[PDB]
Assembly symmetry: C4
Homo-oligomer: 328 residues x 4
Amino acid sequence: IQRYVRKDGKCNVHHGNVRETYRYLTDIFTTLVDLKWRFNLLIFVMVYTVTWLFFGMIWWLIAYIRGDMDHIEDPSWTPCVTNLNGFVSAFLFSIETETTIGYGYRVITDKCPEGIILLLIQSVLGSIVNAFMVGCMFVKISQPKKRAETLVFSTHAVISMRDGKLCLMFRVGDLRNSHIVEASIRAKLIKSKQTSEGEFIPLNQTDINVGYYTGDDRLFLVSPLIISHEINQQSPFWEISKAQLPKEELEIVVILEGMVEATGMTCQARSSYITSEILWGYRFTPVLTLEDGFYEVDYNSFHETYETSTPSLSAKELAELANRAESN
Amino acid sequence: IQRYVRKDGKCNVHHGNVRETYRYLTDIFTTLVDLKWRFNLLIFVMVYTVTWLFFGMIWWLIAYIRGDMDHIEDPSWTPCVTNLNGFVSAFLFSIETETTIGYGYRVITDKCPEGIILLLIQSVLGSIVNAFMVGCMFVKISQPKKRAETLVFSTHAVISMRDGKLCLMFRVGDLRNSHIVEASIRAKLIKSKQTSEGEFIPLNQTDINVGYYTGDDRLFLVSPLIISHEINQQSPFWEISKAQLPKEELEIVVILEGMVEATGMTCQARSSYITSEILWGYRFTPVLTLEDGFYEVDYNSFHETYETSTPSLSAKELAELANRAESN
Amino acid sequence: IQRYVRKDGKCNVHHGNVRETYRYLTDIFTTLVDLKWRFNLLIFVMVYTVTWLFFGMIWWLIAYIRGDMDHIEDPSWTPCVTNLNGFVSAFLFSIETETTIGYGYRVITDKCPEGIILLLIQSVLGSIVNAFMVGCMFVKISQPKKRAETLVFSTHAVISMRDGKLCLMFRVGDLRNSHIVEASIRAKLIKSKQTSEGEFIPLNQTDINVGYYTGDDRLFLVSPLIISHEINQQSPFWEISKAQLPKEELEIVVILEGMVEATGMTCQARSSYITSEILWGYRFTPVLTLEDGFYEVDYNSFHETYETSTPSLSAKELAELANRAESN
Amino acid sequence: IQRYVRKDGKCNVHHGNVRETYRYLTDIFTTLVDLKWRFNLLIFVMVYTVTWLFFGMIWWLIAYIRGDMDHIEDPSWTPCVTNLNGFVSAFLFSIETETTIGYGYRVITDKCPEGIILLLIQSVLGSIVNAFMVGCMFVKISQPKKRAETLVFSTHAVISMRDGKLCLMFRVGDLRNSHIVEASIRAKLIKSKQTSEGEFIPLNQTDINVGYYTGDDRLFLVSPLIISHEINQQSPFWEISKAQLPKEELEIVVILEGMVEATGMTCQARSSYITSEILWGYRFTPVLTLEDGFYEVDYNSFHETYETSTPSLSAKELAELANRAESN
Ligand SMILES: [K+]
Ligand SMILES: [K+]
Ligand SMILES: [K+]
Ligand SMILES: [K+]
Ligand SMILES: [K+]
Ligand SMILES: [K+]
Ligand SMILES: [K+]
Ligand SMILES: [K+]
Ligand code: NA
Ligand code: NA
Ligand code: NA
Ligand code: NA
């Protein structure tokens, strides 16, 4: 069985037999900005070209219906647009007006009522197309998920004693000098199970306590923080000894959410720990040192761990043995 | 009695005798973007045309007051704008300036102080109108409620045993490969009641526990999740047996909220279960399979349920019978 | 003593002797969009005019330094800009370029290196000014606080029995067919106090329970909801009888927060109840009726209350008397 | 040991040996808007100039390949662009088209297929560059962190009795007449520790209760509020007497988060109290007075404190002595 989430945060999941694809067009905006730049840069170019054409032919049709084509050199009659020499000239005008470059070689004149209301309709719809594409671009340029790129998770998780309690720990970092606002950490245990009743539940999610009851899950994340899950009665890890752990088949998905200081927008950084990435009996190497009026983070030690003396017993047995020690 | 919320999420409610309609114009922005596209495409066209007119007449009035109309072919005097042959020419200029196409057949000149400050006033207000409409368009194009279109809720809810407890379950899905960020699930029971004191409360809302005390209500929603409400003492469903359920007249409104990964914006997807859509003694069909390095969701099974052996007793009686079994 | 918050939500507070006014310019954006439209429409006009001037003189200075003014009619030499007849012509050009209308009577030419890099600098800064003002406009046009205009609070609060408990109730409404997303209700009791130690605390805020422990404070607000605060031991209202209430000097500030469905933006609607707006022994008139497949809200009854049989005793004494009734 | 956070909110932390600098370009948007204006104003100018060049040479290359340069004065043949006299003329045209000023001295004509699709490609990419830079500007102009500038924290924290309990108090303010929406206050104690097991934890963060269990941490912040942390068994301050405090080496980081009323965007204001900024046995001076129908805040007293009779004992000993007083 392969992991549900990769160490970089992408999920190993494919959505198949989605029969209502009608839905992807119902929010087209979302499908567009979700697309790869290649697809956006293409569509943008296509959308622009078809608008110039679709109006360039309408500019040519009205030019043909009015009878401007017939005489192209007479004093008395003036066409809707001066200088429209053929099949392509209307295309340049259609651009001069929608991009509003309007070189003024191709100029509108009074003769057709049909012309004025078109230039109007164009300019109006010329704003609606241009906006949509710019809008679409800005969003895609400014989307938060990119910030996740500079949010890092320690490569392993560790289990070791902390003031009498066995803790599952992982370390988290923000590489930017800016802040993740309303930052918070949650974590899900993913492992298959079967209920007494027989129901096999493929990749069952159960939330792991990492501060939610005390609000310690609400981070102030400048220098890297070790996030710590205390293995108590309620922990999924309560009955797991050093010796059992490798035989367990589970995955902890670790999820960091907050807002990009600059754009108020919320991002989500993810990582994952499969059973072979949890080191029993280890500790995270310090990364902080105080040099001349600033705290210096040595990211060379960010992922680094070291072994310490640690019980091999499950937290449950540790407790039981301690409660009897007290009780003697 | 008909449902408060339809399976697609729209609410069967009409607001009548709203006497302060003065309020809808106090936030006009909101009424506009809430309108149907037909109404936006109309207004946009109207707003543009009236600005060109309202300035086109001011351009004609100043042109008339200065005395430019009188002589249209003399060497010495130059008008505020070259080439203004009649009632319509000013309209083209009024467009050439606000859309800033400015074909340069119609060009401004120095003779009137009144002209320069107008072109200024126009351009300034020409930005304020254009912005407003673009702004209005982008919003309406980029609004989150559309994402809800690709968020799905299982067609039925089910009640069946799970590790000794009777649970009310429904299944939820996200059809897009992108993430709903800070996703969460809440659910309200809607049913009429009467207090001891006589007060009849038409469609009384009471929240249903679906993870809020443990933070299990905060979803990591990739492949579909069965959301599970354990029917305990506090549940509205505590004293409801298989046999009573059909006689009950209640509705569970199910509400999913989160942020569209791309635009940081929060959306809300809704669905509803009326009493005849809750299947007692059923289970959701698995939708997950593991094929060659990715988890495959078979959405053909998304809504599908199957019958399993299940007590017909209310959870309350189940508990009572179990507590006595233990007590023997 | 006058109320801290008015029934419409504005706060009766003035900030005086703010000595660091340096701060209002440090976030100028915020001061600008907070200003009245009159001040925005003014500034916008001023900012535009000064940019055209400040560049119009630079266009005239370079025109003077190069020696273009001296000869205005010679074949061999061409100026940086054709047709600059005097002190004002440069101003039109300065507009033709920043608004990018560029009528092409005033056209740039090759003779000056100093000219090309200016047109560049202008256009670049011409985008930075135009953006800022548009940006500033859109925000101010699209700000959420306006939505609050269509969020309503019942005019009175009521106290009366509900299933054995004395409750403080108020009613809340949303006049729009759209949704407030992640809507929620909180309420603060404001009243002066003095600690045992002597410390007089002018307008002390203490939060009033209206659903926060059960998540009932998270609204699904379609038709109007009666928000209900149960007066228990923890309530500020525990030792207040019908007879005491009028002598009490307190204010309940009621605060509704959520996101405008269309623009993801969060708004806050406020209202207030002073001691004389709390009716003891009343109930809210129903506003819901079911007519032909939709629920109809009759907003004529929204604020309306009616009297019902209700104990005159404080909830504390009610409890005490009930606990002794049980105990007999 | 120097403070982790300064009184103005900046953090004394440097990120060193960040080896994956590849990441800063992966979200370039974020690095750009995070930069100083000098760097933005520079880049903006550079990006614009290189686009005009990169297209100005392509306009010159096609002009050279077609054979327009060779003859610059002949009747029969027309170039792709009229009036391109040399190495610089193409640059003006490249500007006339991307800024869409298009003075119409330099005008496109029909002769080259290669020209039309370029003008198209330019205009299309001319929108993508202009958008990006405007977008980048608006964000940077409109970023919330600036609002923090008008959110203030009292200069000291105080410890003194309040209705029988020893409290750690600090005062917070909002200088603007506008509201911070969904405002909230949290606070972290930062102090080094060593676990029983030996593990030294450099600047250990533990959250301090300031209202989170009752929702009193959710502010309605008009006039300044004294935020109060009750020193109970769970408080880090439980075993700290007046006499010990100065010997303690700890820092309370105080964090205020909410949304700028106008732009829905979330900001975070920070301040810090090191051990020598906590005054034992003091109280905050009132800042509220009621003058003629509005509450007047006298910010001259905002930071001001005064001494009051206060026990010198740790809250723990205070409790113990009180519990024995009751027990006698
Ligand atoms: K909690
Ligand atoms: K909770
Ligand atoms: K809670
Ligand atoms: K233009
Ligand atoms: K133009
Ligand atoms: K032009
Ligand atoms: K022109
Ligand atoms: K809580
Ligand atoms: Na950081
Ligand atoms: Na998904
Ligand atoms: Na509503
Ligand atoms: Na304020």
